[PDB]
Amino acid sequence: DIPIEARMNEIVHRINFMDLFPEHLVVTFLAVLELMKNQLLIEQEHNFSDIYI
Amino acid sequence: RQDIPIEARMNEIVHSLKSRGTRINFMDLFPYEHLVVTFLAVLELMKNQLVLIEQEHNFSDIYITGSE
Amino acid sequence: MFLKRLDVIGFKSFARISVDFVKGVTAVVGPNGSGKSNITDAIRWVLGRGGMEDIIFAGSDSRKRLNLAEVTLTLDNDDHFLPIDFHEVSVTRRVYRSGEEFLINNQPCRLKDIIDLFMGKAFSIISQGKVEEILSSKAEDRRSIFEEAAGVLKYKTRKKKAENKLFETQDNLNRVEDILHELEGQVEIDEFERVNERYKFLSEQKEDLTEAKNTLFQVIEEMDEEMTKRFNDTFVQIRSHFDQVFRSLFGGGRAELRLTDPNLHSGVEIIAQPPKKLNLNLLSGGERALTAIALLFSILKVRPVPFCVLDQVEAALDEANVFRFAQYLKKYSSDTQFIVITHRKGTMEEADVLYGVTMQESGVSKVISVK
Amino acid sequence: MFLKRLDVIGFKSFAERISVDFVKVTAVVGPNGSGKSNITDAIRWVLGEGGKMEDIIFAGSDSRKRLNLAEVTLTLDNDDHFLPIDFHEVSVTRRVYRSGESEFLINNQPCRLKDIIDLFMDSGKEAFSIISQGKVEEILSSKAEDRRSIFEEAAGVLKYKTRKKKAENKLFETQDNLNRVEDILHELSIDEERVNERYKFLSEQKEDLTEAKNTLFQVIEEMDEEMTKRFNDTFVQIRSHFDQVFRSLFGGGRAELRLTDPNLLSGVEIIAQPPGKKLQNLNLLSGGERALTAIALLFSILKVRPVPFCVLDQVEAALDEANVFRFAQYLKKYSSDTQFIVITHRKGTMEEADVLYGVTMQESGVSKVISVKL
Ligand SMILES: Nc1ncnc2c1ncn2[C@@H]1O[C@H](COP(=O)(O)OP(=O)(O)OP(O)(O)=S)[C@@H](O)[C@H]1O
Ligand SMILES: Nc1ncnc2c1ncn2[C@@H]1O[C@H](COP(=O)(O)OP(=O)(O)OP(O)(O)=S)[C@@H](O)[C@H]1O
Ligand SMILES: [Co+2]
Ligand SMILES: [Mg+2]
Ligand SMILES: [Mg+2]
């Protein structure tokens, strides 16, 4: 819950999912997987490529 | 991690019994959320017959004694 | 019924341990094999993995099979939720290696004693993965899970016994009829005044039944008026909370719960639609989980039971919705006592009490607790 | 058959055309409502078996549309020609059209119903190399005489079974024949008896051909001797893998596998007695004891007849906070000779995984896929 919104407000100050990273990259992605499910986006060229928010 | 404190605590709980012999006190072994996992590890090693703990009653201060 | 303590000797993995259930959530944590699921099967064998003697410890190195297994439950009856005046109730059950028993307040009692006393913690306890047990069950077999929640089972069972009695009453009037038909011809020395000396009083003697039975049928008919009414009064109060819990779990998800036919036997049929028309068989492992879970916390809003136990009810849902089955378990900590057995730390964070179960000493389970 | 990628269109939750790239461990994340445990329904759909067949196609969310055309593809590296085909990039597709019409296609050519079976009969993508959700303990609770065949297709002995079955039918038909013609051979001035030379020409030659099918068919029926031998060779090969795998899951375990009687055709019984317990039954195991043991028995199989790619629907679902991490270790030490598809919500296996395809669901009832590597 806390890690799932600690980057939510930080998404209004667009960049890659790795731009929100410093090992815990897993959990960070897992949160973005929910926010998508809440309609709040996700861009990628193709599989396992640059992922922009 | 969860597995890392399992054996990371195995140094401070075996060397405290080799220093004072006093059982590692969960009240003393308190690192800092953390009081859940850190209890879950000791509350695991008991199945490997690696550590024993005593309680005169429930909810009483718990002391970890690794050996068997 | 306020849970106070639980003592165990000889019951499955139980090596003579006491559990002091605190106010709020108690998380029953630990790794596998500890036997924390026994802590629900004992709260089965005391209220009402074997087959008999399979309930008793048998075999572990560094120990020996026992012959007698017993469990006690100490309940604070200060508010008299039980039909006794005691402020500390203590119920115990036991089984002998010989296959032979229960005590109420340190005193022996009949078989249907504890049963009659609690009338109650079925769907009050959720064992491993049995959650979905509500959904998959047929609609005709689903209303049972409501009938207990509506207390209709008391008036119901009684009424059944009363009809059973009416059957025997008719069984007596049957022979009485033939007897009297013989007395009509036997009617028309003074020793024949001995035969009419039984029929005139046997008229008010058979009429004694021909009245009491009529005093019983009415006692059935309007007794269903207090069952068939209570079933609806509860059903709707759970209706108006289905949407509340369900939606509070799925932001924007709206669902409902309806029934079929009059009542008696009304198959309750369940519907759900996450935020998308989802036959509910097509729901995810979590979507099948947070349904019987929301439905629970709506029932827990109508007839909330004080002792409610859940065994790994959250092992099917992502950490995002574990917080759901965590906070809805952190609110109702005040209104009712929740004992959950889940190794997922997400619920173990808000749990007021942590009771760690391990197993030392070979197949023997010990207990620790902190909070 | 090194897995390459999988494309889905119109399949169940999958509405927009999306695919997944697989590596040599791939953890399929995503929160509930999404499609991760669906992707496995599609992986079994590709090779072989919601309600009926219509519920396979995207029913449609009332935020988008209602599609009526569903199809799945699979691309594999057959460099070593794992299968009886000479292609080095194989593409297998199955189609479902709302007309009630299914299709099958490989490269440029349509395929038959009972065709794609045979291509895979030797490989064993075994559907039992797929661990399902709420099925992780299936083999442990299932009856002995319902756990025998899993070894049969593990040893590969299924193809031989189809052989001896069909051969059995043939030998029956030929027996009926020779029996019927023996009755014709039994039913059989001066002028010209010239038809008897053909009668004995339609028997002494004809019963010679049929009776040449006898001795030739019962030798292919004796090829079941190879099927039973190879089976038992494997039946025993799994044996001494149990305990060693078990004992490394349960420190100090003791378990073993054994059969009933002799007469393939029998049943198998598992025995498990964890360290510092024993003396018990299978029904008396813990909730995660059955989970790990089944895991050991379905993790040791792949040390004998390994497969290319396996499926895990919530295998570590009911397990400890540690016996998952050990399950993660094992997933890493076996990820070499086979590709792993795991569906897990706990971070434990995710840390020991190579690349995750996290499944989201945006646009209402539609699944999206995002992948990341380590
Ligand atoms: N009746 C019994 N007699 C002897 N040992 C038992 C008995 N019941 C359980 N055990 C021991 O405990 C183990 C399993 O007990 P369970 O009660 O099913 O454990 P569990 O509570 O389900 O564990 P978890 O972590 O909660 S999933 C067995 O391997 C035994 O060693
Ligand atoms: N045939 C279908 N047509 C339309 N929607 C479907 C279909 N099958 C599944 N869905 C949608 O997908 C959801 C459940 O799909 P599942 O495949 O069981 O989810 P899941 O894969 O178990 O998700 P997780 O997170 O991986 S557990 C339902 O809410 C539906 O909205
Ligand atoms: Co009083
Ligand atoms: Mg359990
Ligand atoms: Mg799933």
Author numbering:
A (entry chain D): 178 to 190, 198 to 206, 211 to 228, 230 to 242
B (entry chain C): 176 to 207, 211 to 246
C (entry chain A): 1 to 15, 17 to 49, 57 to 59, 61 to 109, 111 to 129, 134 to 135, 137 to 203, 991 to 1065, ...
D (entry chain B): 1 to 24, 26 to 50, 58 to 132, 135 to 198, 990 to 993, 995 to 1065, 1067 to 1068, 1070 to 1178
Lines from the paper:
SMC subunits comprise an ABC ATPase “head” and a “hinge” dimerization domain connected by a 49 nm coiled-coil “arm. Here, we elucidate the architecture of prokaryotic Smc dimers by high-throughput cysteine cross-linking and crystallography.
To better define the structural differences between Smc heads aligned at the end of the Smc rod and those engaged via ATP, we solved another crystal structure: “BsSmcHd-CC30:ATPγS-ScpAC” comprising ATPγS bound Bs Smc(E1118Q) heads with 30-residue coiled coils associated with the C-terminal winged-helix domain of Bs ScpA (ScpAC). The arrangement of the two head domains in BsSmcHd-CC30:ATPγS-ScpAC shows a high degree of similarity (RMSD < 1 Å) with a previously solved structure of an ATP dimer of Pf Smc heads lacking coiled coils and ScpA (Lammens et al., 2004). These large distances are incompatible with their efficient cross-linking by BMOE, implying that cysteine cross-linking takes place on Smc dimers with disengaged heads. To convert the rod-shaped into the ATP-engaged state, we need two operations: the sliding of Smc heads toward each other along an axis connecting the two ATP-binding pockets by about 10 Å and the tilting of one Smc head relative to the other head by about 85° around a similar axis.
